[PDB]
Amino acid sequence: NEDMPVERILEAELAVEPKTETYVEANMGLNPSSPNDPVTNICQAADKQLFTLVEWAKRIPHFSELPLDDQVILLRAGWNELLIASFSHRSIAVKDGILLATGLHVHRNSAHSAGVGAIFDRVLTELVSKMRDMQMDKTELGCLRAIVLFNPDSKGLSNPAEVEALREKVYASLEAYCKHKYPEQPGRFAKLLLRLPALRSIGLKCLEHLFFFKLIGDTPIDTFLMEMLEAP
């Protein structure tokens, strides 16, 4: 398969990430005022990465060659697990912590002491830990970040088998790379997909958290971020 250019995907990943990557630590999360308030800080991040996720979408093969409404749909049913896979991968660079796109690190301790240790732990164990142990590259990332994008089962899809057709072309392009660049291990391609159920559940658990801080917490939520969460 050449219809889904692996080169154009690894290139789309490269475009997203900031050219200037500096990292500062975050305060324990005892106070919502400080520049560093764990939860608050994640929300500022996800809002920013919301915009760039859009452009990451575009740069993906055939995504712009879809209806206006098939694009919005796929984002509504993916931005969650898509942004999660982003920082999940980025944070393989460090142990017991999370690298945020604002240029801020977040330690496992700031998590627990902010209430969100349960899920923070789950991301490192099911995502950050796994991608690392398996040495999953940036190309492979974009191929999963893409497969999630093109989710056939998204409800309200004007053309279901259309989105299911692209998610077949990424399956090909990717298995190629996994049997090409990584021929030593057979089931490498399969190992890369095995993390999808875990990310689905994690994505769901993360929505929950987001809904609580909105409808209860004093967590200052922003525009674009806001728009992406609308489902009881």
Binding site: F51, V54, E55, V72, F224
Partner: peptide
């Protein structure tokens, strides 16, 4: 959805 429609266009 105001915000998203704009990015996907321009």
């Amino acid at each position: 959805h105001k915000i998203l429609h704009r990015l996907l266009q321009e």
